[PDB]
Amino acid sequence: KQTGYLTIGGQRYQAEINDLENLGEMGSGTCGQVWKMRFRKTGHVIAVKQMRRSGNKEENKRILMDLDVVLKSHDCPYIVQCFGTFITNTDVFIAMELMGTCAEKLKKRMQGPIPERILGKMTVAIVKALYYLKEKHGVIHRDVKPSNILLDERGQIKLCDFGISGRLAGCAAYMAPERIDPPYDIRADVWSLGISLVELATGQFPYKNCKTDFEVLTKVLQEEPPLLPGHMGFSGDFQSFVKDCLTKDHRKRPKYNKLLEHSFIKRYETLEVDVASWFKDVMAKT
Ligand SMILES: *CCC(=O)N1CCC[C@@H](n2nc(-c3cnc4[nH]ccc4c3)c3c(N)ncnc32)C1
């Protein structure tokens, strides 16, 4: 409702675009251009997305859509938080908390499987964020995948990027069977979450031998659901949870309310996992 303000933590600072120094771009254009910037008044370093008024019409619709969800989700601790906005005659700047890395780049830096104790805390955060979006807003994400799961140096794990979210098409590799072949898609992000967990738990994407998008959709419908390997020491609860996410018939796929009662969730809802120190170790490679 208000622009021209930054609220780092619990402190409000009147701010304009010229009060921030550009520390370079964070390379990708998933939604729009994202800059890493420094608040010269306090020294904090933040992420700012620049939306030009002359930019692509389709791209700007998604950037505003994503901002609409983020502003409404201010009270969800598993969703990324907007720090403020600046509106000029030619651009809109969206300030946001600076996270460390996404789960995709973490897998690339690790060059191998990601431990179960990290994926447990990630599962709890992603399930509760989706559950929050359905219940408090009737919004489904429609694009759950490791590149939209962010982690930071303090160990926080948060969902981001709601540019194609719906209020009741994503990447073909993570699309649920019913999204590919509709009979609805209320339980479709659950399938994407299970595909993402199998990928991070093994370091290998389950459909990695496909050369076109359509071939991936064919293997999703024709093959059995990709299982969690049984000789990597994974606990019975981790295997049981992924099997439930990856039910092929969406009618039999469990609900968010039922998934939040799984023994895999109850375990990591209360366990003390030092994901902050495990993060600093991965970031200190290569
Ligand atoms: C694998 C993750 C990745 O490479 N990303 C693409 C480049 C930018 C990375 N990133 N994006 C944001 C972000 C998300 N949503 C927004 N709405 C308004 C402003 C933003 C910014 C990031 C933040 N906040 N911190 C760290 N990295 C970020 C994702």
Positive or negative: CA dihedral 8, 23, 26, 111: negative
* 138 and 262 part of one domain: yes
What is the distance of C-alpha 109 from the center of its chain? 18
* 265 and 181 part of one domain: yes
Contacts of 58-61 with C-beta under 8 Å, sequence gap 24+, read 59/31, 59/32
Contact by Cβ (8 Å): 142, 130: no
Of 46, 65, 99, the one marking the end of a domain is: 99
Contact by Cβ (8 Å): 158, 129: yes
Q: How many domains in the chain?
A: 2
SS (H, E, C) 70-123: HHHCCCCCCECCEEEEEECCCEEEEEECCCCEEHHHHHHHHCCCCCHHHHHHHH
- Give the whole-angstrom CA distance, residue 141 versus residue 160: 9
* 80 and 123 part of one domain: no
* 59 and 120 part of one domain: no
Task: Output helix, strand, coil percentages for the chain, rounded to the nearest 5.
Answer: 40, 20, 40
* 189 and 235 part of one domain: yes
* 232 and 261 part of one domain: yes
Contact by Cβ (8 Å): 25, 34: yes
Place of tokens 């509760």: 128
Of 45, 67, 99, the one marking the end of a domain is: 99
CATH number of the domain within which 235 lies: 1.10.510.10
Domain span at residue 226 reads 100-286
Of 99, 129, 153, the one marking the end of a domain is: 99
* 64 and 184 part of one domain: no
* 157 and 250 part of one domain: yes
143 is catalytic: yes
* 55 and 108 part of one domain: no
The answer to the question of whether 27 is labelled as a binding residue is yes
Closest CA to 3 of 74, 92, 70: 92
* 164 and 284 part of one domain: yes
Residue of 48, 71, 150, 279 to mutate, ligand 1, most atoms within 8 A of C-beta:
150
HSE toward the beta carbon, residue 245, CA cutoff 13 A:
29
- Ligand 1 mean position to 156 CA, how many Å? 14
Chain breaks in the chain (C to N over 2.5 A) after: 168, 183
**Given the DSSP bridges, would you call strands 101-102 and 157-159 parallel, antiparallel or unpaired?**
unpaired
* 9 and 28 part of one domain: yes
Contact by Cβ (8 Å): 86, 3: yes
* 88 and 127 part of one domain: no
- Ligand 1 mean position to 137 CA, how many Å? 23
- Experimental determination technique: X-ray
The token duo for 272 is 């003390």
